[model samples]
Target chain A: FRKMAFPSGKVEGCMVQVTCGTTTLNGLWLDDVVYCPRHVICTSEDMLNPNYEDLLIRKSNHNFLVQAGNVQLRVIGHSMQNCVLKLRVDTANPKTPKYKFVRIQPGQTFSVLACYNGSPSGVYQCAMRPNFTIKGSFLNGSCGSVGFNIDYDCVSFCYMHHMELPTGVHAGTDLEGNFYGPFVDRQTAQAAGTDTTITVNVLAWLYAAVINGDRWFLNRFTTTLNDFNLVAMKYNYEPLTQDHVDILGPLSAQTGIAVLDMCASLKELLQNGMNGRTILGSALLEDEFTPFDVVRQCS
Target chain B: FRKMAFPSGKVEGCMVQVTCGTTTLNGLWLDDVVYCPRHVICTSEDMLNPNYEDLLIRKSNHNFLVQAGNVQLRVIGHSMQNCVLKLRVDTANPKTPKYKFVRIQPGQTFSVLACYNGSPSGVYQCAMRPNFTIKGSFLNGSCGSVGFNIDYDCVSFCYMHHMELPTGVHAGTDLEGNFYGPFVDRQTAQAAGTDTTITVNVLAWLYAAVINGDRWFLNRFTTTLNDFNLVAMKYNYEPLTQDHVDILGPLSAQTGIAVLDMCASLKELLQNGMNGRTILGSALLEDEFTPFDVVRQ
Candidate 1:
């Protein structure tokens, strides 16, 4: 199978896998071209001696920012205030295509919309496995000012790596506000007529468990006001770094749950349970992966 | 498919997927029964409030130890040393079933045997993607004292999670020595005529990348004496843990390369290039999974 043709745009830490004609082309927009790097691109804050290329899928950023793509030549709400639009695109739509236009809001606003329901295990599947399509043109959203105007038409899906979700979206957040971003594309990423397989050995598979554990553990903070100290205790490691400690530094509580809202159709569509949409952060899902979406057959 | 019945055994952080009949039963020998926990099993030494169940696949040890299984009523290199034996069974065999008997060797002895060569990225395959068969009855090794006679047969295939190797095998050794374990089962784990799927979302897939990065980083420590300070810097976080500092604490240089030895037949079989074996460490491989072994057809 080949890579799907994206509508054309980019993201800070975006990972894209679209179903095109004969294959599902996975791509990451780097150096202005979308090429599938080894599935997953992580953010690092240290930035001392960044080895982004060595990691194949690594970009050196601490915050998982979803720097929305700018749609030049756009509109305000419907008229006036014409300028460049930076909108957070959410595609977990119903039978109807819905849109909310924002100018400058905390990206966490959308992350709250992506809370992981109650289940914090397994790979989120609501992404790429898109089966239903929301129809519309020049659809939802518009952000701009005088002299600059871009159509939010395709919204041109753009998101970031582990971005901060307000107070605690990281279970509640990375302490430093790390969360996956530019997270979704409204209508572009859907209908995978192509099938493939991604072969992951044991430990690599478990790494997700580590990430998932951290997520739920962080969430527990909100419910129990658990501190990172307890979580570090849970991690069973010693000397918690301020980077990690700060994750729950101001910690803990029920802000929201977009996880369920994110993957509203998941458990049934693929016939299992992810309880949320698989936010394809380059560092997480091995996009551009061409193996099998169905049960694999090994001899 | 159902969980493949194992030869009936266990591992500290072992994740198993074997084909018995219609299913591949996955199990972790915990509390007596081999129940499939989530994908990875890590080791922690903090000893505080160990959240083992929360992580589902975690044990509380920092060492990736591989304590061999014992077989009662057996032989001593086929003679009189009839005692309990702990053996390191290597299944990346080529023919002639080879057996090496060691009395009490540092499990790192084997970790050296698992060196990941030069490439360190994706999952190590050579572990469970068994396609070859080495025939025999009570296959390989013998350890005992006329009291503990156990058949290395099946080697019972028990390994630990991230066991340590000597020197620099954290690429060299985990400073504290952690490496994935009892790592392999001989003869019994072949012919995976079963097929299935293990759906992993994106981040989980990338987590492997993170682990792989740390691995190579440690390896680089051996090659460049880069130190954990540099490695932690590489992790991009501020302040380092003594635990992390010690990873490359002993740092630097090539003593061997079993990574290549581990996956000798890879590259062409699975067809890409992990450059070595898929260690199947619960934290890395995500085993107990049953979803496709063939081209994923």
Candidate 2:
């Protein structure tokens, strides 16, 4: 049997034990985070891959929100495989506690209110069965589940995926008291100012980050920007306040610096007056973010 | 029974005679054009509407291209109504010369190549029956059909619709030896310099025109811009050749002046330094071309 050290000790409510015939392993569950003993063909060369470490250490920890009364789980599905997610909730009635399952397509998110339906909140353990079967069967691989007490202090949380809403999905508050939207409205889009350079400049940085595949930049920028969004929504979509400036000012500045750093290499290409073909071919300028309107809304 | 004066002179290949018992109307044919004597409740008040005149005159005349060996007809459908169009071509064999019909959805263009199977070039009169029926009947409306002699010089002409292709259409050279495409490739778009202030400033002007609804600005600018497109395409999408400057220089300069005139009103609004809410509310600061990436590519 093989065992690995946890990145930052044990994560709460994310522990599981597995005993396969003569072999047994017990620790914090990390599916894509760390190597799944059942699935991963661990090798010395493969061990160098960052996903093996970062996914378990960071992605698992970050893929959740534990507000005072709310707990939301964001399960990032495998990019190229469709799967069913079965979340088993530990309850007082151990015989048949509660089971919630959702069909998740590849690269799509399966976010659920883990502590919904008035289930008493305690040290409840929930385990995910990815690529879960219709027969309620899942591979014995564990990541981690969140723990939170359900309360009724309703503050709206929204998830934006840019563009317009999917067909049959309405743009407003759902029954779960969370808002899901593109945030930017049509009329607002039509009336946007042409004077703002920051909008395009920001996009230039974003494009560079994506093109270069800078994982560090991607993670930092996106995570910080997500915080930027929460701050914006916190204020009812108004302009920046003093308190907002105090909190978000550093973040925005850091992001600006990060953008500059990312663009430093590409800046030379732009300044040297690179040929249209070279720039277009290398950067895929024609397709991704060709128009600013394409990324106008938050995703 | 009722007759009206033609907008211009008599139209070629569109002469028809209509009879209803004792009364008969004859001569030029017009449908949703200069005047439709049969359907239009023609009045001085109705004449005030430009579509009744322009849609008839310009749409009728510009709707066809008849080359030496080719013929193409473009019929604009009613934006709100789906209809079938029946066109009758005058030919040597009256029984089976050429009868074409196409079902057109609302806002759809029904473009067809009239005669491809070795029909002789002659003074062929064609008439349309809109919202046509299988009862083998139609309204007595004849918009002029084109005459073609068919030359194969083969210089392709493509029309750009700002962005994206039309539905159910592929981009390529068609059977008629004419090229239809996006024409402007991705490389060309990227090579377009970000340093060019004119790109964004020109858009600024366009936004101003839309916001103000300046008819004179819209008509002149768009028409001139259409000419600009032709000139650019004609020269193989090169940057401002001497010929381009000669033809389109004055127009661009004039449009620059026109944009300045339009922005004069908004200058006062900006000078007032309105609140964030007011500015955002009025012009919708949150939307439009808010992203730099929009202008970046």
Candidate 3:
């Protein structure tokens, strides 16, 4: 019997038997380091060459803005001239390369978000001409002066920069004259330092709800658009500041009041729903968030 | 007594009285046009400019970037040399004008995110160096640059543009050479036509739970990272496509198996406490979206 150790470690729940000229082994599993050897760990870098990918993946070359992604490439035709653009991708299967042909007018671009899901690694060749022809090589992939000059000035691969809405009160005009609101608060802002603000507020609300012995009351926070408004009313406190940190401090003192002004406001808002009969407390119960039949019963 | 008719319209819950030469009026609330006189309409444009404030107010004229909000202003000190940049705000009270003095190094920026919170409208004055001072006027207040050469070229009042993250699998670095993130799923992406792709996948999971007859299982969807994973496992479906819409077709054929592979994966994942636990469904839930929760449940 001939016996040799299994490679890449033993496979759990998997048993293999091997017989040598004069001997046989009954049990073979992945966990047996003595019988099987472990394989070295592999990483994405092994599959994608970092340096090669970086050099070849270009953006903003000439009039074309090339934004590359793991899934696809976005090529923008950013010139004021009309032309037919050809994009070709060469992967492991060079014979059947993925190709896209688009006719873009002045200041227009085309992309079906083409991806190179072909064989292995690949190269991309792009060209634009006044008209269309099917043949080209990487060396001669240029439309001369007639084509928009191409340069590899891709500032952002995923377009991270200069794509945010401008801050402030600015108006706009589409084909339909005037448009309202590109409001700053309605938009997402970068997390330079204030990233933890929301997390802090959420955790603080959780702690306050826990202390109140009404953990499920946290659902109230989710349902009402004016959660902080309700909390301010329930606690008989002033409106929370933009920072929202100070509100949590007074949460332990939260109490129910009959003439709570904020509660009245909440009640007024709720009146618009369920034919003006829906109450905040009852809404909670009906939603089954409390897992109880009669808790915080309708007012 | 000289009484004129009220203008605009009747005020919602208001009362007014007028006695002209001992002839008293009975019902003269704002609703009674004959009883009470109404005042003419006024707007901020009227208050800001009876045309009088602009002649009096000045901010570093010749156009300035006007970003309106309650945040910080970032002033880049782009010059190669360092200097103390002084910014001043003037509205009605020049005597008590708001002032910010920032000592900025070359190539460094300053941000106090200052506010005027002053009376009426105003303009800002910024100056640096050997007696270089320029004044421009505006009805409202804004930040002005001094030695760095100021232009009304405030392209972004709050720097909104170029501040958003693209959808899925993107990363970048700042001038400081520090990298941002490949932070999938946390950040918001622009809603191209196919914006609700994620929403659809999550809703599909809820509906699948409903078919299972365990309404409370909705909570499992929220608490479990593998909500969709379990859904995928239960149906013997392949991994959800990135587009997510592609995964819904087979959901109709969802069936029960003896031991769901993804369901077990979820159980293993939740075995840890909050340290091991992460949320998925709540992000959708918090957005005020129930699609068909209790209905499906």
Candidate 4:
């Protein structure tokens, strides 16, 4: 038996309108997945890895970003050995938001959650054996709000994992919007032929965001002078404290950047997320970046 | 078992040696609950929430702060209906790290993790039914590190829940070490009586952290003119960019707070985890605050 390579992002939609047994959410998400919105589309038959036996789906720890939603899933009549899962991401509509069923192989490990954060949170991006991963990375986070139904019920963290969270779970994000398959270092990762510089840089972004207590950044990008000059991301915030102001007079005056004398107003912007037009334009400034003039700005 | 109130923060230390079935790490955590250590201590009998039937322990969402660790827990032989959990937090030193067995009520909820991030990540605090809570708040997080033994595999999140994560799960912290009971409004919450101004302020701290990608703050407090000068928390950091510096000269020169000329150094401090000593001294300055020199500075 060989490992079947079912196409990912290939799942169109399921005709079997489903009412998940323990599921309370209506067909509201893109395909009814109330948690994370993007999913790795695949089928029950597709769930079968010829080289493997059953599909084993487990609950992800809060340590891992389960943005889809908290799930209490069990494949009935069989302890998941004969479990049937519904396809929530529908590519078709009229019946656009219908569901379908897929059977899991005896031991293939699959998991789901009610995703609460991301540029677009609480969605699944159907991933399978071919590329075993449930990735939550590189998002611009405009997808608004977390999954909890109540405001006080949220607990969030961002740690520089040295192999933390799930073995199958990989998570990280550059405020610029990119994920690089685990915090792989350059040497060993380079041995495989490539640079994970941005990955580590994003870890810096993660730590910075985690410590700064501001996780929103725009992954939104655009081309300058055409694709030759791609601006991948922009910062969502900048430091606005007197200490910062007193220390940065030269750069502020030299760069011709706006220096709002109304400290409280800009402080208000800092309180309220105010995305800087360029990376260097924000608090994530220690690192060398393109000058603000070259990158396009959005008001 | 009439809702026993086993002495929480008690249960000194167990005598029996323990090798948790799936546990790989040894007795290291101050008391050995790799995930969220500060638990509400009780006993096997104490776990029996008399109003309940069995001990039903579930895994928390990556949405909750499981600074202790990610748990793959179960009670063998009886499908958790009959499970024995070990007492890892030993109060005795002679046998300081020994374990004890406690039977969870047939329908009690108990969970555990390896713990990865916190002022002091990964340890347990035994809790009983009298007060049902496994809280992870009011932490200064100098505990130094989150639990995953590996580097590449870690995921974290912070969201403002209308009602998110665990029902039993309550989370939030003011960059100062403090946690309020859920996001309650004045009327409903105040009905019970509380200004809860701090709770809401902490949520602002939370939203700021979630969006900022920061989850650390020093819960460290200090006194100025004595008890009357209690600074419950000091902001762990302040934003440092030309924008912030450019915008903040008035306060910097006015208060006489040291604003280093080396912009890049402070930015470096930002990258390197610098801890600002006062709340107002930090980027979290939009709210009402005492003048830089007052408040016993």
Best by DockQ: 4
Clashes of 4: 139
lDDT (Cα, tens digit) per residue for candidate 1, span B115-197: 11111101111112111110100101110000000133212222222211121111111111221222221112222222211
Interface RMSD of 3: 41.0
Task: List TM-scores of chain B, every candidate.
Answer: 0.17, 0.19, 0.17, 0.19
- Which regions of candidate 1 deviate over 4 angstroms? A1-211, A214-299, B1-297
- How much lDDT does candidate 2 score? 0.23
DockQ of each: 0.01, 0.00, 0.01, 0.02
Candidate 1 local Cα displacement, residue B281, angstroms: 26
Q: Against the true structure, whose lDDT is highest? A: 2
Provide the overall lDDT of each model, using Cα atoms, as 2-decimal numbers. 0.20, 0.23, 0.21, 0.22
lDDT of 2 at A155: 16
How would you encode candidate 2's per-residue C-alpha lDDT over B118-186 as one tens digit per residue? 121111111111111000101112111121111121111111111112221112112121222223211
Model 3 ranges off by over 4 Å: A1-47, A52-199, A206-299, B1-250, B253-297
- For every model in order, the TM-score on chain A comes to 0.17, 0.19, 0.16, 0.20
Ranking by TM-score: 4, 1, 2, 3
iRMSD for every model: 19.6, 39.8, 41.0, 25.0
lDDT of 2 at B50: 22
All candidates in order of DockQ, best leading = 4, 1, 3, 2
Please state the CAPRI-style docking class of candidate 1: incorrect
